[model samples]
Target: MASEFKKKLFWRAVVAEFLATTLFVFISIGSALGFKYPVGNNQTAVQDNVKVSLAFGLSIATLAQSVGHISGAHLNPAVTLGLLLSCQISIFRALMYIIAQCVGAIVATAILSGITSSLTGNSLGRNDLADGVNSGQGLGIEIIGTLQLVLCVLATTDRRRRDLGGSAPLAIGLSVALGHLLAIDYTGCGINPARSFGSAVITHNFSNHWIFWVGPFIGGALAVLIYDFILAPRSSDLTDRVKVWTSGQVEEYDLDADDINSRVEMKPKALEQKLISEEDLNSAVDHHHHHH
Candidate 1:
């Protein structure tokens, strides 16, 4: 874990996560500011909801593609947790990514409020329950919404699938859109913990803030459980699973022959004796002679 932090590339990945989340929160939340979308009024609010969803969805699509290779683009804390629990990322990396994401969100929101406060009068796109929706329903909506999002994330990134194609980032973005399209009316749909924290911190509204963190965390864990175990079946047993958790190496579960060959250096005598038997060398010569 300590060695992982010392790598320069790891810091670059953390910075990528920070910048990606900053852009995501700025673009997505910036769209919601100054807009009068009354939650209770179905007449005028319905049209605005589509735009909001698209703003968030397309922002994710763009940002994920931009930084996906650099950082895996886990812009949300919940997504980072999902990756951590599934052993896709090291514990230290997960902690750094989550910290970067939260700080990125806060910085973006602070800049947003500074620029738009004069025009928007302090609306920062904070998540909250609408009229007729209680805390229980709000929490459930966030959980289910985040579950779908994280499931898509895990499944799309699963290397075990040969049938996987198309843009993984776009699929994740669409999942985010799907969440907002449905849950915007119910709870303003914060499937990301960092995003909710950003808005709440800027607006000074910690009311019902626990729902965003707790709900997405449970949802992310559930997604990891279902996808890593039930659908993909990554490791064989508990010991391997624990090893995966403790090991700082990513993608260590599958090491190809080329990867092994690159890491190994051998003397010619031992290589010749061990690598190719007499029959093996004879078959190669016979095959060459036959081909000629």
Candidate 2:
């Protein structure tokens, strides 16, 4: 297990997961419970269902933008598991992330419960299957919803798209909100198994609980397999490399002409001499002589 954590920043990654999940669940459930809609109003007032979904999505987006590079921004067990399956993350790191997410969610829920208890009757803002939605439909919705979420994650985090700037978290969060718009009416949009499990254990509402876990796991796994194996960037692909050079005309090169095998083999020695300054030429010769 220790060997699996090859990355020296594993603990930092776990901490990021913990903080992200804590913020996600606490804010989401707090909005759902503490804020109320006006009676007889056709429109929702303070905390509408859509607002709750947006809260969840946007919070995750913010956290991902803040810590994604450090920790992969895996605030959910489903995502960690999917990354593990795809071999983007090690098993030990995945397990640590899952544990961190679960604990963070539980702690968030407990804090919310305490806050709500202070206001009125104790309510933890637990989620449940909505009207006209059965267990099977809920499961299906979770599966498809999580599939789309993971797909968005893969696309945004793709190495090919890394040069596109800081658009990854925004894209992923928008995708989450889109999923919630469709699935919130079904099972409150449990695309995250850790989120669902934490709520269930806190509220003791186990109705169709297995749907959230099973559906998200399957959906995330499928997305990872498809992205990593089928649509991943290849080493032989020149698109990203071309984009890199074309994006910037003047850049520093760490390696000299002879240091690069491709350039050395392709360009003539005379052409290389023409590109290098006399001082640099002498320095390179001296460096190589010293090495020899």
Candidate 3:
């Protein structure tokens, strides 16, 4: 169990995950439910399958951007489990994240159900095996989609990659969009088991629900192993160098009276007086004179 403060932080992160996931599902399912664009409508309702996928993908992208740092922005159980396997998270933390994601998804689905009931006179945002999509194909699509999503997660969140200027939310979101674009037709692109399960439970539709759970979990596990073991960037010596440099600076300032006096006396007065180099000053002056 965590300390009281850590427990609080965990719950806060959980709440954030719930809120983000709820927003994601509400917008995505709403778009799917409400929009049906005609050939010549001012605002085309969900006319294009690609557009529907993009809407779902972009909503997740936006949420990840807003809340990723606070909660790891998992919004999915498979992601939490994968991170746990990678040792990026503790078992307890993983459980919290998963529970939060499930709860959030359930809430979102419930809300969607209410809205759909009001507008369409029925609950329409439920997860089911759409026309011609069987359990086998759905499973395959989810596995492949989740593999791509988790691979991007590993790449963007790798510390070494971040040091090289990778942006976590952007990369993760783009990867999600890419997955949806390819897999939406097959399985409605459910790379998140919690998302599928929640919607199914709320809507009372469990057709091929096992595929969503099994496929995403397997894909997430494979991604973590591949990234953490096979394709992981080598640990850089820079972290150690940074630690040493930081320690040196702290030691220089945190010295006792005797140490401070000795170092001060050894330092040159003129050198201490000027923080900028003479060469830099000369270059600046030359540049100004030339411009005139």
Q: Tell me the tens digit of each residue's lDDT in model 3 across 22-100.
A: 8876677766664441223576333555666667667776676675543344665656666766454446765767777
> Which residues of candidate 2, in runs, are more than 4 Å off?
1-10, 34-47, 68-72, 86-91, 119-124, 161-166, 205-207, 230-292
| lDDT of each residue in 49-142, candidate 2, tens digit only | 5777777778777677675443334666766666665344446666777788887777887776667554653233455556655655767787
Leading candidate by lDDT: 1
Candidate 1 at residue 9, lDDT? 55
Model 1, span 1-292: residue lDDT tens: 3565554656776887777778888777766763553324557444466777667767777776665532344667767777877455446776777888888888887787767645644345664445644434657777787777788777776777654556878777778877766555466646677777777675554447676678778877888868665445555565544444434455464432435445446554653445543544444345344544
Q: Which ranges in model 1 have alpha carbons more than 4 Å from their true place?
A: 1-10, 37-46, 68-72, 86-91, 127-129, 132-136, 162-165, 205-207, 230-292
Candidate 1 RMSD computed on C-alpha atoms after optimal superposition onto the true structure: 10.8
Model 2 residue 8 CA deviation (Å) reads 14
lDDT of each: 0.67, 0.66, 0.63
Clashing pairs in 2: none
TM value for model 2 = 0.67
Q: Would you list the clashing residue pairs of candidate 1?
A: none
Q: TM-score of each candidate?
A: 0.66, 0.67, 0.67
Return whichever of 1 and 3 wins on TM-score.
3
